[PDB]
Amino acid sequence: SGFRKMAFPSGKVEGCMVQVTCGTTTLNGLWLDDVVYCPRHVICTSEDMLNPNYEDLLIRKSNHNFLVQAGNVQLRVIGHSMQNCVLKLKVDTANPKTPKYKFVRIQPGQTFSVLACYNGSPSGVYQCAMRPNFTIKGSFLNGSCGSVGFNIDYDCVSFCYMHHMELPTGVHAGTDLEGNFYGPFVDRQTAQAAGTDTTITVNVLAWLYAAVINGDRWFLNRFTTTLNDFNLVAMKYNYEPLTQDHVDILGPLSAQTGIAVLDMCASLKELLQNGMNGRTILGSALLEDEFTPFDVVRQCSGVTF
Amino acid sequence: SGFRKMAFPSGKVEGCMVQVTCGTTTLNGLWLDDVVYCPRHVICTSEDMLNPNYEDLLIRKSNHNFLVQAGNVQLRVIGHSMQNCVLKLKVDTANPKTPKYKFVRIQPGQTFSVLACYNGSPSGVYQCAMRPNFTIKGSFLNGSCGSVGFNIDYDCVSFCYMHHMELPTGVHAGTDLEGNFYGPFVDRQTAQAAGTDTTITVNVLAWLYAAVINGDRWFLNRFTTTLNDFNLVAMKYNYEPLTQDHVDILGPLSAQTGIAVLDMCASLKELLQNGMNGRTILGSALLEDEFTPFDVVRQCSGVTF
Ligand SMILES: *CC(=O)N1N=C(c2ccccc2)C[C@@H]1c1cccc2nccnc12
Ligand SMILES: *CC(=O)N1N=C(c2ccccc2)C[C@@H]1c1cccc2nccnc12
């Protein structure tokens, strides 16, 4: 049946993308009800980014200094305020295309879809995981600021990420929809450290179950292991330790395939210790950790929205 | 800046997905203007699929035997006809959400986005390439029939694929929007051969340019080669031969990076002959061929729709 990195349909989110301009700077905004959300660094010039004092920079700005455009229509700004690293522009008209929505702060290891935008217009959609070190490995060029990450539950869009910056290492950093950064990052053009990244062990195991469901079974060995013995091998390979919560979450995929979680752990241990020996799993020559146990189940059931 | 497998925004295509039922069989249809397009095997039972005579099976069906539903609204069917392996149901109302559209028959090696649907509702979106052997490696469960593939050019949606079946090998087969299968496949439950698959050489080269644009340069060697010498190595590795048309298409990426196409060919030759030696390129331990030279340029310019 196949297994792919699948993003959510983006239609409900396209209808919310606007263009926000403040002087020389243009970026993307999110229009829900009568409020437009965008990164607060829309108020900065290139020079201001070296060491910005956002409170002082914002005081020089009035409602008329912000131009919001949705399609070829100019929204009128009647209020402005800073909430952490997000700017909230109150507009005179509610978005008629506002979907049912929630703002959520996702956990490291969880996935979401990104609708990459430029000048308020969508260009593409792809799936991402929030790394354990709170960075994402996306595809974002200059102008993509304000692009959002989200998940869908039938009719409800849960927004979880807003793009703010690229670190000098090439990975991406951003905030939740309340303006709080994921990780220790700050909205300033200064060299910042993301820290050691680790592999999402529960996600690699979920992907091994999807491989068995789709006929790939070569990696299955005759060994089993214990949670502590496996974790001795996980720490050496910078893999996050496995806990009984992760084993419980893997329950449905273990019940569907007849393979106990600890037996799948022993196979992962031998893959970590001996490599793939020129072989592939689900069309990949690496161990994949950007698929949660939920993403595996959704793709095998055909859950719709 | 990053490089990802990015699908087109799916909003314009979600508005066209309907559910089509004929007796016991339900699948997805595409509603454009006053016509619904769906696989003709919507008229079959499971037993009929072993050896269907579509002309005889369709004669037993009248307009009232087809139920078309878009959301919770039942469209009235006022005409029906078979065009190759596609059924065309004329309805009494035009889709108010019909985008600007074209039907196109794509070439092997070209890419497109798939909006996987179940019961007329979208579940996800992902990018695919039409393999040189006219199969696709997608993610499709029972009920996904009628799901469509497409590309977007600013405001115009070009539909290129309709999902019809999975081969016993796990790969997927389907038609263009005129009902003509890509490849030698037929809509029957019989064992079918896809034939030897080859690697899209021009796509692997485009991906090597994107790697250099994003800082990955380790694979660049001090060698060059000729078109015929490279093709001697391509034939041995089941890679499609490179021609001056492919070299011309790679022109912009060669001009952007300062690396002649034939020098990138020599690097590909050494990667084919010596492997990756435990290293990765753009987060992959395999040579990627599902990105066209156009997909690389779009992702480095930020082209919007
Ligand atoms: C996310 C994004 O588009 N940008 N982030 C930028 C940044 C610069 C210094 C420190 C942190 C973040 C620059 C770039 C950007 C933002 C807003 C408007 C733009 N217009 C043109 C080009 N780049 C940008
Ligand atoms: C594409 C698709 O969903 N299906 N294709 C099927 C097929 C069977 C035999 C030979 C060729 C193709 C079966 C499956 C399907 C189609 C239509 C309705 C369904 N309802 C439930 C389950 N599967 C299907």
Coordinates of N, CA, C and O in Angstrom, one line a residue, chain A residues 25-94:
Chain A
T25 N 10.1 46.5 5.4 CA 10.0 45.1 5.7 C 8.6 44.4 5.4 O 7.6 44.8 5.9
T26 N 8.6 43.4 4.6 CA 7.4 42.6 4.3 C 7.6 41.1 4.7 O 8.6 40.5 4.5
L27 N 6.6 40.6 5.4 CA 6.6 39.2 5.8 C 5.1 38.6 5.8 O 4.2 39.3 5.3
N28 N 4.9 37.4 6.1 CA 3.6 36.7 6.1 C 3.0 36.9 7.5 O 3.6 36.9 8.5
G29 N 1.6 37.0 7.5 CA 0.8 37.1 8.7 C -0.3 36.1 8.6 O -0.7 35.6 7.6
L30 N -0.8 35.7 9.8 CA -1.9 34.8 9.9 C -3.2 35.6 10.4 O -3.2 36.1 11.5
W31 N -4.2 35.6 9.6 CA -5.5 36.3 9.8 C -6.6 35.4 10.3 O -7.2 34.6 9.5
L32 N -6.9 35.4 11.6 CA -7.9 34.6 12.2 C -8.8 35.6 13.0 O -8.4 36.4 13.7
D33 N -10.2 35.5 12.7 CA -11.1 36.5 13.2 C -10.7 37.9 12.8 O -10.2 38.1 11.7
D34 N -10.6 38.9 13.7 CA -10.2 40.3 13.4 C -8.8 40.6 13.9 O -8.5 41.7 14.2
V35 N -7.9 39.6 14.0 CA -6.5 39.7 14.4 C -5.5 39.1 13.4 O -5.7 38.0 12.9
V36 N -4.4 39.8 13.1 CA -3.4 39.3 12.2 C -2.1 39.1 13.1 O -1.7 40.0 13.8
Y37 N -1.6 37.9 13.1 CA -0.4 37.5 13.9 C 0.8 37.4 12.9 O 0.7 36.9 11.9
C38 N 1.9 38.0 13.3 CA 3.2 37.9 12.5 C 4.4 38.1 13.4 O 4.3 38.5 14.5
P39 N 5.6 37.7 13.0 CA 6.8 37.9 13.8 C 7.0 39.4 14.1 O 6.8 40.3 13.3
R40 N 7.3 39.7 15.4 CA 7.5 41.1 15.8 C 8.7 41.8 15.0 O 8.7 43.1 14.9
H41 N 9.7 41.0 14.5 CA 10.8 41.7 13.7 C 10.3 42.3 12.4 O 11.2 42.8 11.7
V42 N 9.0 42.3 12.1 CA 8.5 43.0 10.9 C 8.8 44.6 11.1 O 8.8 45.3 10.1
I43 N 8.9 45.0 12.4 CA 9.2 46.4 12.7 C 10.7 46.8 12.6 O 11.0 48.0 12.8
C44 N 11.6 45.9 12.3 CA 13.0 46.1 12.2 C 13.5 46.4 10.8 O 12.9 45.8 9.9
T45 N 14.6 47.1 10.7 CA 15.4 47.2 9.5 C 16.4 46.1 9.6 O 16.5 45.4 10.6
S46 N 17.3 45.9 8.6 CA 18.4 44.9 8.7 C 19.4 45.3 9.8 O 19.8 44.4 10.5
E47 N 19.7 46.6 9.9 CA 20.7 47.0 10.9 C 20.1 46.8 12.4 O 20.9 46.4 13.2
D48 N 18.8 47.1 12.6 CA 18.2 46.9 13.9 C 18.3 45.5 14.4 O 18.4 45.3 15.6
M49 N 18.4 44.5 13.5 CA 18.5 43.0 13.9 C 19.7 42.7 14.6 O 19.7 41.6 15.3
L50 N 20.8 43.5 14.5 CA 22.0 43.1 15.2 C 21.8 43.2 16.7 O 22.4 42.3 17.4
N51 N 21.1 44.2 17.3 CA 20.8 44.3 18.7 C 19.5 45.1 18.8 O 19.5 46.3 19.1
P52 N 18.3 44.5 18.6 CA 17.0 45.2 18.6 C 16.5 45.4 20.1 O 16.5 44.5 20.9
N53 N 15.9 46.6 20.3 CA 15.2 46.9 21.6 C 13.8 47.0 21.1 O 13.4 48.1 20.6
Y54 N 13.1 45.9 21.0 CA 11.7 45.8 20.5 C 10.8 46.8 21.1 O 10.0 47.4 20.4
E55 N 10.8 47.0 22.4 CA 9.9 48.0 23.1 C 10.1 49.4 22.6 O 9.2 50.0 22.2
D56 N 11.4 49.8 22.4 CA 11.7 51.2 21.9 C 11.3 51.3 20.4 O 10.9 52.4 20.0
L57 N 11.6 50.2 19.6 CA 11.3 50.2 18.2 C 9.8 50.3 17.9 O 9.4 51.0 17.0
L58 N 9.0 49.6 18.7 CA 7.5 49.5 18.6 C 6.8 50.8 18.9 O 5.8 51.2 18.3
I59 N 7.4 51.6 19.9 CA 6.9 52.9 20.3 C 6.9 53.9 19.2 O 6.0 54.8 19.1
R60 N 7.9 53.8 18.3 CA 7.9 54.6 17.1 C 6.8 54.3 16.0 O 6.7 55.0 15.0
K61 N 6.1 53.2 16.2 CA 5.1 52.7 15.3 C 3.6 53.0 15.7 O 3.3 52.7 16.9
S62 N 2.8 53.4 14.8 CA 1.4 53.7 15.0 C 0.6 52.7 14.1 O 1.2 52.0 13.2
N63 N -0.7 52.6 14.3 CA -1.6 51.7 13.5 C -1.4 51.9 12.0 O -1.3 50.9 11.2
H64 N -1.3 53.1 11.6 CA -1.2 53.5 10.1 C 0.2 53.1 9.5 O 0.3 53.1 8.3
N65 N 1.2 52.7 10.4 CA 2.5 52.2 9.9 C 2.4 50.7 9.4 O 3.4 50.2 8.9
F66 N 1.3 50.0 9.7 CA 1.2 48.6 9.3 C 0.3 48.4 8.2 O -0.9 48.8 8.3
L67 N 0.7 47.8 7.1 CA -0.1 47.6 5.9 C -0.4 46.1 5.9 O 0.5 45.3 5.8
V68 N -1.7 45.7 5.9 CA -2.1 44.3 5.9 C -2.8 44.1 4.6 O -3.7 44.9 4.3
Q69 N -2.4 43.1 3.7 CA -3.1 42.9 2.5 C -3.4 41.4 2.3 O -2.6 40.5 2.5
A70 N -4.7 41.1 2.0 CA -5.2 39.7 1.8 C -5.7 39.7 0.4 O -6.7 40.3 0.1
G71 N -4.9 39.1 -0.5 CA -5.3 39.2 -2.0 C -4.9 40.6 -2.4 O -3.9 41.1 -2.1
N72 N -5.9 41.2 -3.2 CA -5.7 42.6 -3.6 C -6.5 43.6 -2.7 O -6.8 44.7 -3.1
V73 N -6.8 43.2 -1.5 CA -7.6 44.0 -0.6 C -6.8 44.5 0.7 O -6.3 43.6 1.3
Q74 N -6.8 45.8 1.0 CA -6.1 46.3 2.1 C -7.0 46.3 3.4 O -8.0 47.0 3.4
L75 N -6.6 45.6 4.4 CA -7.3 45.6 5.7 C -6.9 46.8 6.5 O -5.7 47.2 6.4
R76 N -7.8 47.4 7.2 CA -7.5 48.6 8.0 C -7.1 48.1 9.4 O -7.9 47.4 10.1
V77 N -6.0 48.6 9.9 CA -5.4 48.3 11.3 C -5.9 49.3 12.3 O -5.7 50.5 12.2
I78 N -6.7 48.8 13.3 CA -7.2 49.6 14.4 C -6.7 49.4 15.8 O -7.2 49.9 16.8
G79 N -5.6 48.6 15.9 CA -5.0 48.3 17.1 C -3.7 47.5 16.9 O -3.6 46.7 16.0
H80 N -2.7 47.6 17.8 CA -1.5 46.9 17.7 C -1.0 46.6 19.1 O -1.1 47.5 20.0
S81 N -0.4 45.4 19.3 CA 0.3 45.1 20.5 C 1.3 43.9 20.4 O 1.1 43.1 19.5
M82 N 2.3 43.9 21.3 CA 3.3 42.9 21.2 C 3.0 41.8 22.3 O 2.7 42.2 23.4
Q83 N 3.0 40.6 21.9 CA 2.8 39.5 22.8 C 4.1 38.6 22.7 O 4.2 37.9 21.6
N84 N 5.0 38.7 23.6 CA 6.3 38.0 23.5 C 7.0 38.3 22.2 O 7.2 39.5 21.9
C85 N 7.3 37.4 21.3 CA 7.9 37.7 20.0 C 7.0 37.8 18.8 O 7.4 37.8 17.6
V86 N 5.6 37.9 19.1 CA 4.6 38.0 18.1 C 3.9 39.4 18.1 O 3.7 39.9 19.2
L87 N 3.6 39.9 17.0 CA 2.9 41.2 16.9 C 1.5 40.8 16.5 O 1.2 39.9 15.7
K88 N 0.5 41.4 17.2 CA -0.9 41.2 17.0 C -1.5 42.5 16.5 O -1.5 43.5 17.2
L89 N -2.0 42.5 15.2 CA -2.6 43.6 14.6 C -4.1 43.5 14.6 O -4.5 42.5 13.9
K90 N -4.8 44.3 15.3 CA -6.3 44.2 15.3 C -6.8 44.9 14.0 O -6.3 46.0 13.7
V91 N -7.6 44.2 13.2 CA -8.1 44.8 12.0 C -9.6 45.0 12.1 O -10.3 44.5 13.0
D92 N -10.2 45.8 11.1 CA -11.6 46.2 11.2 C -12.6 45.1 10.7 O -13.8 45.2 10.9
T93 N -12.0 44.1 9.9 CA -12.9 43.0 9.4 C -12.4 41.6 9.8 O -11.2 41.3 9.8
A94 N -13.3 40.8 10.2 CA -13.1 39.4 10.5 C -12.8 38.6 9.2 O -13.4 38.9 8.2

